[PDB]
Design a protein around this ligand. Structure first.
Ligand SMILES: [Cu+2]
Ligand SMILES: [Cu+2]
Ligand code: NA
Lengths: 620, 620
């Protein structure tokens, strides 16, 4: 019934049938992206029309197409031919990754480079990576992947321990041509293995860890209805899944007495970029747009009970399309559970004699994705007190290189001869806000220091200032941790019982933003990552901070083009885009497999409620 | 057996006897502080000598004394008379709290102020607050408390809902004189109650929460020996307790193979200040030094199983002295337990076919204190991967005032006519470092951006720089979140297998430091709070960042005086002092009892180990 329900296998099969009947999905076509469109703005609107957006690639080299289909009515709504040299290439296909290593194994330049290093081609793995846009004019309008080589000594060996530095190749994956092979010189291949399940490396396993048992004897406190609608401790929301963005939260609302009060209409991680900071020509092109180029939902893991998710777990198993339009289920791809979260509130009062303690808990919605060497966990948390938090967990195996003799300013040493280039992991959260409805505004709040003098004779006073962002051209903001800067999203037409506008406050971690030179290719393609906060007026087609087609696309799309419209955002339907990330100088302890590091953000009520919203929590 | 064992009831009883026989503990004497002294520096220290430091107050007006006694030998080691106008007053005594309300209840100025407001003196509670040092020359050398009034409508009523603004009194608690009563005008006393257990306010309690059962069927993974020595998952440490500082961690070390490697010699929260930013003369003097003036350990809560600490809990019950030298047990004052902490490391490798997941855990050592309206939880965490983290949890009831007609730049409105002045909560962690031994140094690490040009043709490179702090005069540092600034504590004489000095990196939260004007009394007395990081050379008597006697001390004591010695800290026995805090603009949701907010810091290994230290964690 719900328009926000997960896509079903039948819906995906029906999209395939509709495309086939329309003549759009013959044997030379491949589906590079397929996802459900959210309902347009309008309460009720069209009753039931589930629409899907499809990007269709052609392996014969014909122009690709963007197609919108109505699965309800069995019709193609629109189909447009794309000029990829202008608007960008489609996302990378899983089947294109395998092509790179195979093509290189028969290229005379590649074989000659490996022979110079006394390497057996049968043992050389090639990491196929997105190409970006640089100085190679022949790449415009072609689908290019770039390949970096690693040696696998035996089938269970971690190839990441054995990078083949000084060598890179570029491959046209449609015409199946190796365009360039670049060899800047022989580096020793690091010889130490990185096999973290080898007892020679682990030593004997610990026998000291006693079990921790987390159980819910009466079951969990949340309910799931309609497949993906959650009700938990006054919160209400729908859990969506999109092959590009991964988990998407819809319709986040809080039940305050008799009233269901909206907070966030749609929350997602709408892009994530991983730029590398090594100026070697072997790697200076390396920038992953995991969301926009690779599609993080496509690579979601099946999560194992007791290992990945511990406790009383409820799973969702989202369905995506494969490259031919057949449904593929990601079994146990989303874990949901509640967690104890320590003390919520506590006070022992001398004068009244009352001692009061209450415990907190949070609802957790998570998934994990694996892109090559890296593994990322995406965690959304809802707390009893109205706080919403996102946390990204980064782990996996660091990307490696040789460590140059004499050292490096841009690479860490992990093991003898083994380096790890400096890089960042930067996320963009897209928060389509709906604080008590859609009439919202953003205020920047700074601490204000005051000078000792008249009206402040003891020099103790301090204050704060709020500045309303009224137009998009002034809504590109930077962090300032030293002034305690936060941003408040409020509804100027909905007041609390003190006659102040209701609001939520965004607390950032204030980590560095994109470090690359502003003139670089990556700064132009990932312009969102250069500033901490952007606010736009809502528009149906403004979905991603990097635009629709990120692969091999120059600048020109995404947030800088949206904000040029300079739209009114003072008490309007607005979207907050928050950039946050980790700057990774790898340490020895990250090798041979990296312990989790985290980054995120949170939103806390700011006069949204008329008093604490957790006065009705029982004592247990 | 261990020199670091908790003080026992028998030890305190023996101190009382020694003082009594020496003639130092007559009926006019009160113990304001008593604590065990740490062993002096000595890698061959064998002969047991348990020494206690005592501050003795005299209620008849005679000079107080600082006394050191040896419990082992039954002797007074030293006894010095204190000139408090010079070096500061002794900490506030619990018995002096009651004296303020009783003295004001018979003062004709106070009674006339209450009569104008139609307040029954029997219902007026007085919060007894520390005085600080301001313009009143008559207070130098006298023990002063200041009192602010709150109305309790009935014995179980929350008086904090009913502040009596416009009224403050100063009291000499030794001569039992009311020195000043200041009445700046009548403000309405806010009438709404704040009784968070009243069903009229809570509404019906939730019936939706289902239980979360956390058990350890084989018991916990840590061992406790000698009363307070912990071994857990390669970690080794001693858990101390001091009536001023609270929980103190000693001898933090990590067992790396067959070697016990020291990391931190002593960790404590050595001061915490709560400065208020309301310029009203009723409150412009208000600054709590909860550690230095009140002693946070003496107000530690007894923690209840299943409410305060959930899971398989091991308790410590520290012993302190009362004002007469009798031992007093704080039953269940410290909770220790381990808890699951999500994913530790995870990777699914395409090329090897190996799927790997391990879970993380942390050891938790905590206590809770209550000082008047506020309640603070102090949490130390040890993680499997070598991370050490501190977290403070702030809750309780916010301090209130009237909300002025026409509003305020320095006070939030919480309820009709009820205000909450702006304030901060600022902590100082004192970390006596011992990274692989005592020869340590500190480096400041900044991210370095690079410009596009030769050697960086694509404009992607970035780097970092490290600056060694070589003398105390250059070791007062500020945060810089925009450049990703961290501090590394390393041992230049102990190298990892890559021939780099072993180290640990301190990650701050980069919250604002003290906001008061630099010329203010509070900036002088809480100078530590004006900067994020200080490094000193270790000295036995440099224990607190604010000096030994904080109460009514005129300023400059502690860190500014220590740093002025300008000692060598480059490869020496050093102490790191980290300032961190919360800036609190109270929100409606903080009333009538405030949900927990948190702040803290963490330390992560930085080439301390030769590879990841958690390769031997089993799958379970
Ligand atoms: Cu990384
Ligand atoms: Cu506060
Ligand atoms: Na919106």
């Amino acid at each position: 019934a719900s328009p926000f329900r997960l896509a079903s296998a039948g819906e995906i099969s029906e999209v395939q049938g509709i495309l086939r009947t329309a003549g759009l999905l013959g044997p030379e076509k491949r589906i590079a992206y397929l996802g459900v469109l959210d309902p347009a703005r309008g309460a009720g609107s069209e009753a039931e029309d589930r629409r899907f957006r499809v990007f269709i690639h052609d392996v014969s080299g014909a122009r690709p197409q963007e197609v919108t289909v109505s699965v309800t009515n069995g019709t193609v709504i629109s189909a447009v031919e794309l000029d990829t040299a202008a608007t960008g290439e489609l996302p990378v296909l899983e089947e294109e990754f395998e092509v790179v290593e195979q093509l290189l194994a028969t290229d005379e330049r590649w074989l000659k480079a490996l022979a110079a290093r006394n390497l057996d081609v049968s043992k050389v793995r090639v990491a196929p990576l997105s190409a970006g846009v640089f100085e190679y004019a022949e790449e415009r309008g072609r689908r290019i992947l770039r390949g970096l080589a690693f040696v696998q000594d035996f089938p269970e060996d971690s190839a990441w321990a054995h990078p083949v530095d000084g060598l890179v190749a570029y491959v046209d994956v449609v015409s199946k041509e190796v365009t360039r092979v670049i060899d800047t010189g022989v580096f020793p291949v690091p010889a130490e293995h990185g096999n973290y399940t080898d007892p020679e490396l682990t030593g004997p396993l610990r026998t000291t860890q006693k079990p921790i048992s987390i159980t819910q004897p009466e079951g969990p406190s949340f309910t799931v209805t309609g497949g993906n609608h959650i009700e938990w401790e006054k919160w209400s929301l729908d859990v969506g899944f999109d092959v590009r963005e991964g988990v998407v939260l819809h319709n986040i609302a809080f039940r305050d007495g008799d009233r269901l009060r909206p907070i966030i209409n749609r929350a997602s991680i709408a892009e994530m970029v991983v730029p590398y900071g090594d100026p070697s020509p072997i790697r200076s092109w390396q920038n992953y747009f995991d969301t926009g180029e690779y599609l993080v939902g496509q690579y979601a893991n099946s999560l194992e009970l007791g290992c990945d998710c511990l406790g009383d777990i409820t799973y969702l198993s989202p369905v995506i399309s494969d490259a031919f339009g057949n449904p593929r289920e990601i079994r146990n791809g989303i874990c949901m559970h509640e967690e104890d979260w320590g003390i919520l509130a506590k006070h022992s009062d001398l004068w009244s004699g009352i001692n009061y303690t209450r415990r907190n808990r949070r609802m957790v919605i998570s998934f994990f994705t694996t892109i090559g060497n890296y593994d990322y966990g995406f965690y959304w948390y809802l707390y009893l007190d109205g706080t919403i938090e996102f946390e990204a967990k980064a782990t996996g195996v660091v990307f490696t290189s040789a460590f140059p003799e004499g050292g490096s300013d841009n690479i860490s040493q992990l093991a003898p001869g083994l380096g790890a280039p400096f890089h960042q992991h930067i996320f963009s959260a897209r928060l389509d806000m709906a604080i008590d409805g859609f009439t919202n505004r953003v205020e920047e709040e700074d601490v204000v220091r005051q000078t000792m003098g008249p009206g402040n004779e003891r020099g103790n006073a301090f204050s704060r200032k709020r500045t309303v962002l009224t137009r998009e051209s002034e809504a590109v903001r930077e962090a300032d941790a030293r002034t305690g800067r936060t941003w408040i999203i409020s509804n100027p037409e909905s007041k609390n019982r003190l006659n102040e506008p209701v609001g939520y406050k965004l607390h950032a971690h204030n980590q560095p933003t994109l470090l690359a030179d502003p003139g670089s290719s990556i700064a132009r393609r990932a312009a969102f990552a250069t500033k901490d906060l952007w606010v736009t007026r809502y528009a149906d087609d403004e979905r991603y901070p990097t635009g629709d087609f990120v692969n091999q696309h120059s600048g020109g799309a995404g947030l800088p083009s949206y904000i040029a419209q300079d739209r009114d955002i003072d008490g309007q339907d607005i979207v907050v885009w928050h950039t946050f990330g980790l700057t990774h100088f790898p340490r020895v302890e990250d090798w041979p497999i990296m312990p989790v590091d985290t980054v995120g953000f949170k939103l806390r009520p700011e006069g949204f409620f008329d008093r604490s919203p957790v006065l009705d929590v029982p004592a247990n």
